[PDB]
Design a protein around this ligand. Structure first.
Ligand SMILES: Nc1ncnc2c1ncn2[C@@H]1O[C@H](COP(=O)(O)OP(=O)(O)NP(=O)(O)O)[C@@H](O)[C@H]1O
Ligand SMILES: [Mn+2]
Ligand SMILES: [Zn+2]
Lengths: 285, 151, 346, 312, 173, 283
C-alpha cells in the first residue's frame, strides 16, 4: 500500500462556489471558474488543500501538529506532507428540466456525462492499487453505467424525454430501472452523451454581471463592471484524500476526517460563495 | 497562427473610435466589445449575429454608408442611435470574413444587393458559425482590449 | 613566480604548527618539480623602429608623424594573429609518468580510481585529498593531514571536508590564508625574499575574505546589527553577538565599516543559518524578530568596456557600435558616409 | 568501413574532472564535450567486443587488441558532413567547402583576416543550428524527508541535437563491422544511449598538403613538450592546445593518463608530422602506435576528405 | 562515356541557355532528389562576370565559382573560350556527394579570358531576392532537368538549399 | 548481450503531471515542465528512473537487492546498473475538439505532430530488428503515418474538420481506409502539421497561477504569486527500458515489471500531480 488511507469523497455545493482560474488566457468572462482538460469545471487540489487546511487549522486548534504533519508546515518546512489531495472532478451538475410525460414531474435533475464518469473510474482504479481500499460499490455501479456509453440515460427515474436548461431536448433510456442511486438523493441522475452534455453543463454554470457603485452618487463607478462565473448549488464534485503511514495519519483519518462536514472553498465568500459539504464515500455508499 | 489579425484590425476598423463621435454610441461601442464577446461564445455566434442585424438599418444607408468603407476613407457614422454605430460592426465582422476568405466579396457584395440573397448569406453564415466563432475570437478580443485601453 | 613560491615555503616553515601551514610544508616538498612551472603563461610581442624610418638624416620627416599609428598596429596585428592559438598553462606540465605510474604524492586520502581531480581546478590531478564530512579526526590523524586535535580545526578552517586540491590551487589556498606574501611580488627587486617573511611573521594579521555565504547574508547581518542586543539577548551564547576578539580587518569595505557594531561578521552562514543541523532554530530566531530570512543568492556582476582595443587603435567602432562593424574596416571604402560625418564633426 | 553512431537522446561527454557531491555546501556541475574524444568511441567499441582473458594492464594494450586504426570522428547530419573548427576558446562546426580558403585566410593581412575568421565563427558556424547545450539540473532525495538532501544538487549541460545527427568514424577491419552492426550501446557518460549502424565506404588516405585539420586530439609525447611549446607557430595555425586526460578505464576503475594535446578543430601546419616522428623514442613510439590505433592522431586536409594518421 | 559542363550561376539570368536541346545525353551526375542539390561543385581561383556573362578569374581560394555539372555541348557556336579538360573524377571536388563517380570526366566551362582593364573589385553576393530566384525554376532547373516537377513536390526545400548552395565573387565593373 | 532485451512502455497520465525543471525556459511560466529540444514536454530519464526506483523500493522492500542491481546502489555505487530508461517523449496529448462533421460526437481528441512520431519511430526502429522482442506492427503503423508528413492527418476517423482547443480550425483527411489504433483508448488520434500541431499542443498544457494566502487576514502575501505548468491528465509519453543480460534482470522483468501499473512521477504530489499508469507494449 503506497497510501495508508484512501478517502474518496463528494463535494456537495451548499451555495454557489467560485474557485478562480489562474491563467494568462484571455477569456470572455473576467473571472472564470477553474477548468479541467475537457473544459468542465474542476477544483485544483491546490485549492482544495489550501482551503481545507486553512479551515482545519481553526476548527481543531489543538491538533495543529497532526495537521502540520499531514498537510505540511507553513512557513519553515522541513519535510514533505504525508497527505495528498486529488483534483476535484465534476461529478453531477444540476440543470433545470421540463418533462413531457411524468407522473410527478421534476423541475431540476442531476446531469453527468460519460467522460466525467471515466475520469472517476480512473481515480478509483488508480487508488485501488496504491491502497488496500477496494471500492467495489462505486466501481461496479459506475461500470454498469459506463456499459451504456454513448446513449443518454436516466439512471433510475422514467423520463424518456426532457428539455434540459430550457434549450436542449434529449431522449433518454432507463438504465435498467434496476440500479440504486449513486448517492441516495431524491433527484434522478441523467448520464448524457458528451457532446450534448458539454452544452448542458455550460448552461448550468452561472455567469453574473457585477458592478461597483460610487457611494456618493449611486452610479456605476468608471471601470467598476465585470462578469464572474459561479458553479450552482447542489453541484457534486468528486475527489480523494490520500495519506501515508505516520500515526499522525491514523489520527487524521479517524479524528479530523470524521468531524469535517462543512468547509468554505474558493473565494467570494463575503458574498456567500464557497460553503460546501463533504460526504465521505465510505459513508454515502 | 493568429498574428496578423492584430494588423488586420487597424485597416479593418479604420474608424470605430474617432469619427464615432459625441461619446454616446462612441463609448457605447465597448458594450459591444465586452458583452458581444461573452455573448458570442456563451450563447453562440448566430444569436449574436441575428441580434446585430436586427439593429441594422439595412435600407441602402446601412448598406452603403458601410460598403463605402471598402474603398475610400474614415466614415463619420453619426446617423442615429446604434444602427449606423451598429452597421459599422456588421461591417467589422464581414470585413474579417472577406479579408480571411471565409466568405468572398463577389458573394458578399452580391448578397447585400438583392434582398433575395441576404437570406442565404445568413443561411451560409449559419453553417460557418463554428469556424467563424473560433477564428474571429482573437480578432475580436483585439478590439475589445482596444476599447478597454483607448475607446 | 618561483620567488613567491619559495618565500611561501619559508613563511610556512616559520609555522610548523597550526596544522594547515604544516600540511602546506609537507606537500610543498613533494611537489617542487611540479610546482616549478608557473601556473600562468604570458605572451610577449615586440616591434622595432629605426632612424631609417623617422629622419631625413637631420630632422623629422613627413609620414614620420604616422610612424606610431603604424607600428602600434603592426604590434596589435601580431597579437591578434598569435591569439589564434590558445595553449593552456596545464599543458606545460609533465604528468604522464606521474599519473600512469602512481608517482603523484597522495598526501591525504587515496583515490580508488588512480588519482583524483582538483575540485578547485578541475583539470589538474589532486595532491591534498580531504576525507568527506562523516568522521575526520579518526581519519585526518591516521592519515597524514594533521597531527593532533588542535590542528584539525585550523586545517578544517581553510580546506573544507572533501576539497581535493592540485598543487597550484593548494598554493592558492596557502596564499589565501594570509595574503601578505604578495609583497614578494608586489615590490620585487627592492627587499629580500626574507625581509618580507620576517615582517609578516612579526606583525601577525589575519584577514577575512568574504565567501558567497557572506554576500548572500549581507542584509541579514545588516538587520541583526540594528537589533544589537535586542536580538542578542535571545542568543547571547553563540558568538554571533559576541566580542571582536582579535583586530581582524579586511578589504571588503562593508565588512570593514560594520565590524564594531555588536555582531560578529566573521561567522560562516554555512554554519548558522545555511546549515542543516541549525537554521530551524535560526528560522525561529528570525521569525521572532521581524528578520527577513536570507536568500541563498548573490549577484556576480561583470562588465567590460566596448571596443577599447579599437579605440586605442583610434577606430570608430567605439563611436558607432553596431553601425560600423570591425570587419567593415577591411575595406572602409563602403561605409564612407557615417565615418565622414562623425569624423568631420569631431 | 564507416560506422555511424546515432544518439537516441541528449548525450554527456564530460569535459572536466570530478562530478559527485564531495563538498557538502556546494553544488556540482558538468559540461559535455561537443565531439566525443576518440577514447570514448574506442572504449565503447571495445565494450562491444570485450574479452575476459587479456591485458588488464595499460588498457590500450588489450583495447587495441580488438580494434583497427579508428579514424577520427566528425558530424554527419543528413548525408551532409560537418567538421569541427577551433580557435582561442572558440569551437565551431563548419562543412567541407568553408575549409578551402582557410590557409590563405589566416595569411590575409590583419583586418581582412580577422574579419574572415570572425565571420567563419559567427555566421558560417552551423553548430547552434544542429546542437545546443540542454541544461539538466538533477537532485537526490533523502527518503526520510522526501525532500532534497543537503545541497545534493547538480547541473549537467547535455548535448541536444535539433535534427538527426550521426557521429562518423571509419574502421579498417570488416570482421569488426559485421559484429557490431545494430548494437544499442551506452555511448557516453551518465547512461545515455546511441545506436551503431555500419556501412562500407571508400576514402583515400595518402595526402600531404601544407595544412591539416585535426579530427582528433593530437597527443604530444611529453618529451617534445618544451621542444613544442617554445615554437608553437611552427606547427598549428589556429586552434587550442590543452591538457587532457585520456578518460577512465573500466576494467580497472582508474582515471587514465593526462597528456598535452592539440584539440580537434585546430589547424596544424605540416611541419607537425615529421616533428613528431623525429622527436619520439621507439619505446614511446610503441605506445603512440596504439594511441593512434584508437584514433587520437587523425588529420584531414582542407581540400578533400584526406584521412591521414601522423605516426603511421 | 559522356561529357559534362560546368555552367555558372550569377545574380544574372545569363543561364537561360547553354545547350541546344532540352537534355540530350544519357546520364547526369548532379542530382535533385528530395533532400538536396547533390554532387554540386565549386571551382576556386575564378570569378563571375554578372554582366557580360562568363568567367573572369581571380586567383585565390578566397575566390570561388559555384556551378552545376550538366551533360551538353556549349551552344555549338563557341568553345573558342570555353575550357574543355578531363580529370579522373577524384580531382573532381564535389560538394554533397551522393551518386556515382564516372572516373572519365569531360567538362565544358563558360569563361572568357581576364582581359585586364579594370581594377577587379571582386565582391561576393547572396542568392536571394526571391522575385529574382523563383522564375529560375523551369529554365535553369527544368530546361536541362525535366526530372523535377515530374516526381518532385519537394521544390521549396531544394529551393532552401538554392538560397545558399551558390556563392561567388562577381566583377561589378 | 549488452542490452539484449528491451521493454517499451506508454506513460499514461492518470492525474496531471508536473516534472519540474526549475525556471528553465523563457516563457511566462515560473515553474515549467521538463522540455525537449523542440520545446515539447519531456520526462528526463533521470527523473523517470529515480521515481520508479523509489516506488519499487517502497512497494517491494524484500526485492531491494534485485532493484538495487538493476537500477543502481546508493553507496558502493561501483556496480553499473544493468537497466536504463530512455527519456520519455510526448506521444500524444488530449485536445478539446469542436468537431463540425462525422455525425459522431467527440469532445476531446488525441493530438500529435510528426516530430513527435519521428522521435517515437527513432526509439522504435532502434530496437526491433536489433533486439529480439517482436512488435513490428506498431512500427509499421508509425511508418505508414509518417508517410503523410506535411498535412493534418486524422487516424481511425471520419472527422474531415474540427476546431481544436477552441482556437484552431484544421481540415483533416483519413489515412488510407482504416488502420489498427496505436492507442487502445477508443478516442481518435490526429497527427498534425508540425506547425499547427505545436500551437494546439502548447494550448493543451495547463498553465495555472498559484497563490500563498496570509493565514490570518485571508489575503495574498506580497510576492506570493507564481505560475506552474502541468501536463494534462490522459497525456501519453513513450519510453523504453533497456535490460542488459543478467539473472536478476529476469527477476526484474518477471516479478516486478509485471506488477507495475501505477507509479508516482514528478513533483507536487500533495496537489496530486504525479499519478501515472505504465502500459507496456506487450499486450
Ligand atoms: N589595445 C589594448 N590595450 C590594452 N588592453 C587591451 C587592448 N585591447 C584590448 N585590451 C584588453 O584585452 C582584452 C581583449 O578583449 P576584447 O573583448 O577583444 O577587447 P575589446 O576591445 O573590449 N573587444 P569587446 O570587449 O568585445 O568590445 C580585454 O580585457 C581588453 O580590456
Ligand atoms: Mn572590452
Ligand atoms: Zn586546482
Amino acid at each position: 500500500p503506497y497510501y495508508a488511507f484512501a478517502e474518496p469523497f463528494f463535494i456537495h455545493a451548499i451555495t454557489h462556489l467560485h474557485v478562480g482560474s489562474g491563467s494568462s488566457v484571455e477569456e470572455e468572462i473576467a473571472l472564470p471558474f477553474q477548468r479541467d482538460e475537457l473544459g468542465y469545471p474542476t477544483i485544483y487540489a491546490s485549492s482544495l488543500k489550501g482551503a481545507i487546511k486553512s479551515f482545519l487549522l481553526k476548527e481543531f486548534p489543538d491538533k495543529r501538529d497532526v495537521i502540520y504533519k499531514v498537510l505540511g508546515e507553513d512557513e519553515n518546512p522541513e519535510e514533505a506532507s504525508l497527505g495528498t489531495f486529488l483534483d476535484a472532478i465534476l461529478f453531477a451538475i444540476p440543470s433545470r428540466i421540463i418533462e413531457i410525460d411524468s407522473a410527478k414531474p421534476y423541475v431540476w435533475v442531476y446531469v453527468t456525462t460519460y467522460e466525467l464518469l471515466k475520469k472517476v473510474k480512473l481515480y478509483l482504479d488508480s487508488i485501488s492499487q496504491l491502497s488496500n481500499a477496494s471500492f467495489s460499490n462505486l466501481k461496479n455501479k459506475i461500470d454498469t453505467i459506463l456499459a451504456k456509453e454513448g446513449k443518454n440515460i436516466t439512471l433510475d427515474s422514467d423520463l424518456k424525454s426532457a428539455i434540459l436548461n430550457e434549450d436542449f431536448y434529449v431522449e433518454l433510456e432507463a438504465l435498467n430501472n434496476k440500479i440504486p442511486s449513486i448517492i441516495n438523493a431524491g433527484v434522478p441522475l441523467l448520464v448524457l452523451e458528451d457532446s450534448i452534455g458539454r452544452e448542458v453543463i455550460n448552461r448550468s454554470l452561472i455567469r453574473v454581471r457585477r458592478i461597483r457603485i460610487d457611494r456618493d452618487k449611486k452610479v456605476v463607478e468608471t471601470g467598476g463592471l465585470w462578469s464572474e462565473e459561479y458553479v450552482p448549488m447542489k453541484t457534486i464534485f468528486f475527489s480523494v484524500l490520500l495519506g501515508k503511514e505516520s500515526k499522525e495519519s491514523a489520527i487524521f483519518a479517524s479524528c479530523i476526517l470524521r468531524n469535517l462536514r462543512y468547509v468554505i472553498l474558493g473565494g467570494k465568500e463575503t458574498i456567500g460563495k464557497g460553503i460546501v459539504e463533504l460526504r465521505w464515500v465510505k459513508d454515502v455508499i | 497562427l493568429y498574428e496578423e489579425d492584430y494588423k488586420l484590425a487597424l485597416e479593418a476598423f479604420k474608424k470605430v473610435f474617432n469619427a464615432l463621435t459625441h461619446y454616446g454610441a462612441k463609448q457605447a461601442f465597448r458594450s459591444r466589445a465586452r458583452d458581444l464577446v461573452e455573448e458570442i461564445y456563451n450563447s453562440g455566434f448566430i444569436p449574436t449575429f441575428f441580434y446585430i442585424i436586427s439593429k441594422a438599418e439595412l435600407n441602402s444607408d446601412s448598406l452603403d454608408s458601410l460598403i463605402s468603407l471598402f474603398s475610400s476613407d474614415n466614415a463619420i457614422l453619426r446617423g442615429s442611435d446604434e444602427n449606423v454605430s451598429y452597421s459599422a460592426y456588421l461591417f467589422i465582422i464581414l470585413y474579417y470574413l472577406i479579408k480571411r476568405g471565409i466568405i468572398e466579396q463577389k458573394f458578399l457584395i452580391q448578397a447585400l444587393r438583392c434582398e433575395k440573397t441576404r437570406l442565404d448569406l445568413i443561411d451560409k453564415l449559419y453553417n460557418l458559425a463554428p469556424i467563424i466563432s473560433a477564428k474571429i475570437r482573437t480578432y475580436l478580443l483585439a478590439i475589445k482590449r482596444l476599447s478597454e485601453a483607448l475607446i | 613566480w618561483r620567488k613567491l613560491i619559495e618565500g611561501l615555503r619559508c613563511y610556512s616553515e616559520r609555522k610548523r604548527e597550526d596544522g594547515f601551514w604544516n600540511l602546506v610544508c609537507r606537500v610543498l616538498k613533494l611537489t617542487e618539480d611540479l610546482l616549478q612551472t608557473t601556473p600562468l603563461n604570458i605572451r610577449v610581442k615586440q616591434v622595432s623602429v629605426t632612424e631609417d624610418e623617422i629622419f631625413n638624416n637631420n630632422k623629422l620627416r613627413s609620414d614620420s608623424w604616422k610612424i606610431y599609428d603604424n607600428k602600434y598596429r603592426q604590434l596589435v596585428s601580431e597579437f591578434k594573429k598569435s591569439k589564434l592559438v590558445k595553449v593552456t598553462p596545464e599543458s606545460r606540465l609533465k604528468l604522464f609518468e606521474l599519473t600512469k605510474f602512481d608517482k603523484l604524492p597522495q598526501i591525504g586520502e587515496k583515490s580508488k580510481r588512480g588519482y583524483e581531480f582538483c575540485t578547485s581546478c578541475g583539470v589538474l590531478p589532486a595532491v591534498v585529498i580531504m576525507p568527506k564530512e562523516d568522521e575526520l579526526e579518526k581519519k585526518l590523524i591516521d592519515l597524514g593531514i594533521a597531527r593532533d586535535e588542535k590542528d584539525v580545526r585550523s586545517i578544517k578552517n581553510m580546506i573544507s571536508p572533501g576539497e581535493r586540491l592540485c598543487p597550484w590551487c593548494l598554493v592558492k589556498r596557502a596564499l589565501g590564508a594570509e595574503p601578505r606574501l604578495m609583497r614578494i611580488l608586489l615590490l620585487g627587486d627592492l627587499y629580500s625574499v626574507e625581509k618580507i617573511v620576517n615582517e609578516i611573521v612579526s606583525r601577525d594579521v589575519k584577514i577575512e575574505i568574504p565567501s558567497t555565504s557572506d554576500i548572500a547574508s549581507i542584509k541579514t547581518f545588516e538587520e541583526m546589527i540594528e537589533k544589537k542586543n535586542e536580538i542578542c539577548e535571545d542568543l547571547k551564547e553563540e558568538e554571533v553577538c559576541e566580542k571582536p576578539s582579535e583586530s581582524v580587518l579586511s578589504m571588503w569595505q562593508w565588512f570593514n565599516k560594520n565590524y564594531y557594531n555588536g555582531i560578529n561578521l566573521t561567522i560562516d552562514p554555512e554554519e548558522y543559518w545555511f546549515s542543516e543541523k541549525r537554521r530551524r532554530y535560526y528560522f525561529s530566531v528570525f521569525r521572532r524578530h521581524r528578520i527577513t530570512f536570507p536568500s541563498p543568492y548573490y549577484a556576480l556582476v561583470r562588465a567590460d568596456s566596448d571596443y577599447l582595443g579599437d579605440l586605442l587603435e583610434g577606430k570608430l567602432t567605439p563611436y558607432l557600435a553596431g553601425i560600423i562593424d570591425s570587419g567593415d574596416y577591411a575595406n572602409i571604402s563602403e561605409k564612407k558616409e557615417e565615418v565622414n560625418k562623425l569624423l568631420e564633426e569631431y | 568501413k564507416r560506422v555511424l553512431i546515432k544518439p537516441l537522446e541528449p548525450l554527456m561527454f564530460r569535459s572536466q574532472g570530478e562530478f559527485e557531491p564531495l563538498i557538502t555546501g556546494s553544488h556540482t556541475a558538468a559540461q559535455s564535450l561537443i565531439i566525443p574524444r576518440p577514447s570514448t568511441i574506442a572504449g565503447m567499441l571495445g565494450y562491444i567486443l570485450f574479452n575476459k582473458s587479456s591485458g588488464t594492464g595499460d588498457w590500450l594494450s588489450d583495447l587495441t587488441n580488438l580494434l583497427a586504426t579508428i579514424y577520427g570522428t566528425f558530424i554527419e547530419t543528413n548525408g551532409e558532413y560537418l567538421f569541427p573548427l577551433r580557435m582561442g576558446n572558440h569551437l565551431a562546426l563548419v562543412d567541407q567547402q568553408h575549409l578551402i580558403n582557410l590557409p590563405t585566410l589566416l595569411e590575409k593581412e590583419y583586418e581582412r583576416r580577422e574579419k574572415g575568421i570572425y565571420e567563419l565563427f559567427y555566421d558560417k558556424n552551423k553548430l547552434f543550428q544542429i546542437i545546443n547545450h540542454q541544461d539538466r539540473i538533477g537532485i537526490s532525495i533523502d527518503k526520510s524527508t522526501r525532500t532534497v538532501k543537503e545541497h545534493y544538487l547538480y547541473s549537467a549541460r547535455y548535448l541536444a541535437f535539433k535534427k538527426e545527427v550521426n557521429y562518423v568514424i571509419f574502421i579498417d577491419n570488416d570482421a569488426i563491422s559485421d559484429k557490431i552492426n545494430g548494437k544499442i550501446v551506452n555511448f557516453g557518460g551518465e547512461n545515455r544511449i546511441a545506436k551503431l549502424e555500419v556501412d562500407d565506404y571508400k576514402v583515400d588516405t595518402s595526402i600531404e598538403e601544407e595544412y591539416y585539420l585535426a579530427l582528433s586530439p593530437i597527443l604530444i609525447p611529453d618529451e617534445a613538450l618544451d621542444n613544442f611549446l617554445d615554437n608553437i607557430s611552427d606547427y598549428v595555425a589556429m586552434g587550442k592546445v590543452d591538457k587532457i586526460s585520456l578518460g577512465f578505464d573500466i576494467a580497472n576503475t582508474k582515471r587514465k593518463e593526462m597528456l598535452t594535446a592539440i584539440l580537434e578543430g585546430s589547424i596544424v601546419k605540416r611541419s607537425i608530422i615529421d616533428f613528431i616522428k623525429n622527436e619520439i623514442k621507439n619505446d614511446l613510439r610503441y605506445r603512440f602506435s596504439k594511441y593512434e590505433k584508437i584514433g587520437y592522431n587523425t588529420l584531414m586536409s582542407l581540400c578533400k576528405l584526406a584521412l591521414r594518421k601522423i605516426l603511421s | 562515356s559522356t561529357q559534362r559542363e560546368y555552367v555558372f550561376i550569377p545574380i544574372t539570368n545569363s543561364i537561360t541557355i547553354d545547350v541546344k536541346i532540352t537534355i540530350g545525353g544519357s546520364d547526369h551526375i548532379t542530382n535533385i532528389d528530395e533532400r538536396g542539390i547533390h554532387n554540386v561543385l565549386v571551382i576556386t581561383g575564378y570569378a563571375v562576370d554578372e554582366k557580360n556573362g562568363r568567367l573572369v578569374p581571380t586567383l585565390d581560394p578566397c575566390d570561388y565559382v559555384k556551378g552545376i555539372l550538366v551533360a551538353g555541348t556549349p551552344q555549338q557556336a563557341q568553345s573558342n573560350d570555353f575550357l574543355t579538360l578531363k580529370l579522373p573524377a577524384n580531382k573532381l571536388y564535389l560538394i554533397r556527394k551522393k551518386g556515382n563517380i564516372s572516373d572519365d570526366l569531360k567538362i565544358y566551362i563558360p569563361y572568357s579570358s581576364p582581359d585586364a582593364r579594370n581594377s577587379m573589385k571582386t565582391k561576393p553576393v547572396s542568392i536571394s531576392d526571391d522575385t529574382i530566384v523563383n522564375n529560375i525554376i523551369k529554365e535553369v532547373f527544368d530546361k536541362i532537368y525535366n526530372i523535377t516537377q515530374k516526381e518532385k513536390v519537394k521544390i521549396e526545400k531544394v529551393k532552401e538549399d538554392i538560397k545558399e548552395l551558390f556563392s561567388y565573387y562577381a566583377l561589378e565593373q
